[PDB]
Symmetry: C3
Subunit: 413 residues, 3 copies
């Protein structure tokens, strides 16, 4: 049965203190993955759920508060207690959507062991706060209330069609050849193309040349985008961090400013003519007029009014006129729709979950139930995969994919 | 008829400048009672409505701006002009929900005598402002936007089941015996229990020992709660105080900050899993997971979005599946539901009124009409009582209860 | 056909760089007219749309940032290139509703020539910002978030019944006779009365005597009103200016404060008993209890919650029970309703458009469609007139009226 098989996936992908998103393909700890995965662990062991996030901060967080999207843990034997019991990993230099405070609030409020909850939350709170502070200091220099991503990887939605035009400005001349490894695990037709990776690496090399300095990265990056997904997730996380601060009796004045200015910013991304939220390209100084599943995420933030939520509900229904399974990652009528290729059409369980949560919060119970039912149907028939073809339901991407298993467990708790 | 009998109750309970909540039982002036009662007086004499609140501030307000929940006026003969015309009462050391600015705005805008309205509002405005300022200075030291109550009495909902766990931490060892007087007027089965009063008095004695010093009260009180009711009422009152400030041409910059930070705070109390607003226990650092009628009061504040209001509408409908009369003070399916005991189940007219107001403002006209109809039916059949059994409709608590009469008059104006 | 005839009106009323609102009657450039007219020009020539607003700022904006409601351009021959190519107009001393930033955002985002869009927006942005800054500095000295108008002309709704009581305080003793010129073009029955103009001119003479000094104008004007229309339009314009700032990579911190404080202020104008938004009279210190079409404009600002929007939808439906054509400028049951007289009842195309936009944004598609259909029906049958009788549909006021033509073109794009 579903829950039993989901637990098997999480335990197989566990490395003790963290969970790989998928064996082989993603053999390290990822930031937003660990946050979703921790919700799954609440169905197995509460301590284990906390440990996922302790590990992320303890081994990932940099001295300036930055939380990187990958912690490159060295491979260990799946045995405890090993020689290190009887007797500092590298990280990436970019971030990912900051869903972690939302998960921490949930762990804090619902852990049946209240002494443990207080100990873990008090430990993590100043670390979360330092991460959020880094985001505004490094990525919102104009005090807008919106944070900028400098790499499409930071959206978590690597090859979203939203990033096509911004990425077209990234130089690739004299880029040395490099060796792809994702193609050992996943068919290239389901992955970003060569032209995408060329530009992913060009950006990396620029940042590395700049010694990962925030000021020069902001000024020099040829990719500067206000991602609706990243920002909706940050607004939600700020609201949840505020609640933690009050419950723990810390001063949240700083967080209140982020919330209020962020509400203004996130609502600015709404395009009335399109009836949808768009990411913005700050190099071109233009909205990116591509409707992706990320544009539903302000529901999860809780910023729109009901009318606006109702227009999104209509749009989700429209996408459902063309795809059997909600929610495709891009509008199925978009000329960029590719039903098998990663973030250009396939259904993702984490986004179904966040968007169902948002719709529920706005009273759209039928739509929330549909998003759940489709997610669970996909996993029942095809197992725990990274994404699914919205037309056929076929599994795609990573096999034994952790957040799919995790959210199967969480959603059916 | 209802209105004639209501006027009789108010006139019987009048002591000239203020109205007792009920003869014998409550033989002094109470803060939130006087505010609701003033609305009733608008149906008799506008000057008399203003006088209620002038009296509250003139004889109640302390030098630091604190407005106490009781002004202990000495008994006077019900004759005017007496010897004091031909020829400084004590107060309590705690507060109550600050509904007064909302009432003052209404008196100001609707008094047919505009010169009197301007004179009274100009007089009260700096006093209201000083009270609100005291609340944040004394009860929001961490600049959260939410105010803390240190005594269950300050909620106005003395024995709400929400306060059970917080109150369990209040020491009662070596508490001297004391003599209850409420039981002269009301059956003990309809009142807080001995164990409640023991802890009410323990807190009083602690505050008295500390000479009512705010800093030490905040640090030392074993009862520290963010009450959803108190805070929803404060948010509404801040919005109304802002409007008064602008109309009177005073600078409302200070009030704007309270409003904006309070909106963030009040919305934080929403629990998505429960689909309801909870008060928070700041000693435990946890939401109090008990659904009381106070959790509907953010509607009166005007902070939720419509989706959230619709989830509350569903919950009110649920309570109506189990109780004949809305709105019981606690969920009728709660294990703590006691249909006769004060704030643990009985229907209260003031809360029916505030919640109907809120639902109306969100477009839920049928629900608002039901809350009105039930309130009026209860008073028609059982007279003007403090609260009513939600299953049978039987009157309970104080007899000839002032805010019930007052709001009968106001609601049918 | 409609669009062809609309283009003829705009081209006839063009003076090259700006468009007169109507030949003869309004032979200069007006502030809010030019903003609506620019939307019409997008259907003819994008450069021409920008030029309308460049002209307004370049020849209108004063040294302190004030944008005046009229730029008194001298008459030129309708020939180019004239002698000035082969070989500083006066302005008014009051302002008008600041819809211009909203129009600039639209031109910026939708111009197919991106290089031109960036050039024009970068040029206008600091000018818009200076105008908004002037509004708060001169007209919000108490830091309320709401701006005051000192002349009914500044509402754009010159003789709205809302201004009757405030205008009654303006002295007319010893006012010299003057010579009306509007009556050359429009029947007096469709225009403000003598008693209105007497008070319009009295205010002008006061401001002129004070050398148009903001401090003394605020202190001495016998007319000081918080106009719901002006403020709803300003809130919308602030939101749109914020978006421009972020897209252009300018610091919007200042604008964020205007938005947040303005949201508090605009929502304060809601009267729960009336179920409508009122303008406020700051001399009397009272809401003006007259329901005009301006009270729907907070929908265009995007400040109400859905419940409140639904109460406005009900009110619009009510007005439609009494008038064939929505939206009359005042409640058709008002004792002040005059179906032919300017802003006291007639239907206006610009207000139909803004209110339809607002209703659409709140999910009220049927109502938005009705407002569009009525506007287009009126223009099809009666041509492009300043306003229309809501009972009969008969054209009234200015002939060949520019914003009617412009918005016919924009609405049917
Ligand atoms: Cl809403």
């Amino acid at each position: 049965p579903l829950r039993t098989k989901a637990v098997e996936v999480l335990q197989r992908n566990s490395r003790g203190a963290f969970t790989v998103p998928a064996h082989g393909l993603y053999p390290y700890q990822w930031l937003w993955d660990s946050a979703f995965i921790a919700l799954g662990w609440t169905q197995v062991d509460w301590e284990r759920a906390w440990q996922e996030l302790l590990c992320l901060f303890d081994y990932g967080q940099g001295p300036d508060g930055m939380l990187p999207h990958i912690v490159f843990h060295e491979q260990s034997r799946d045995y405890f207690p090993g020689p290190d019991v009887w007797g500092q990993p590298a990280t990436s230099g970019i971030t990912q959507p900051p869903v972690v405070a939302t998960v921490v609030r949930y762990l804090y409020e619902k852990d049946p062991d209240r002494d443990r909850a207080r100990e873990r939350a008090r430990y993590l709170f100043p670390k979360l706060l330092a991460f959020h502070r880094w985001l505004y200091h490094a990525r919102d220099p104009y005090r807008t209330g919106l944070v900028v991503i400098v790499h499409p990887w930071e959206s978590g939605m690597d090859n979203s069609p939203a990033w096509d035009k911004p990425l077209s400005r990234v130089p690739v001349e004299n880029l040395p050849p490099y060796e792809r490894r994702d193609v050992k695990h996943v068919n290239p037709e389901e992955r970003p193309r060569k032209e995408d990776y060329d530009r992913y690496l060009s950006l990396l090399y620029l940042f590395r040349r700049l010694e990962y300095d925030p000021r020069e990265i902001y000024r020099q990056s040829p990719f500067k985008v206000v991602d609706v997904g990243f920002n909706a997730i940050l607004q939600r996380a700020n609201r949840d961090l505020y609640a933690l601060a009050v419950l723990l009796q810390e001063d949240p004045y700083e967080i209140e400013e982020w919330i209020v200015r962020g509400e203004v910013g996130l609502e600015a991304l709404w395009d009335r003519e399109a009836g949808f939220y768009f990411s913005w390209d700050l190099v071109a100084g233009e909205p990116i007029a591509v409707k992706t599943s990320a544009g539903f995420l302000p529901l999860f933030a809780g910023t729109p009014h009901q009318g606006r939520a109702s227009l999104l509900a209509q749009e989700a229904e429209r996408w459902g006129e063309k795809a059997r399974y909600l929610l495709p990652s891009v509008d199925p009528t978009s000329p960029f729709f590719e039903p098998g290729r990663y973030w250009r059409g396939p259904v993702w369980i984490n986004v179904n979950w966040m968007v169902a949560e948002g719709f529920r919060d706005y009273g759209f119970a039928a739509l929330a139930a549909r998003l759940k039912a489709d997610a669970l149907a996909l996993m029942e028939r095809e197992g725990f995969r990274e994404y699914y073809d919205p037309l056929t339901g076929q599994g795609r991407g990573g096999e034994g994919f952790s957040w799919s298993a995790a959210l199967a467990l969480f959603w059916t708790r």
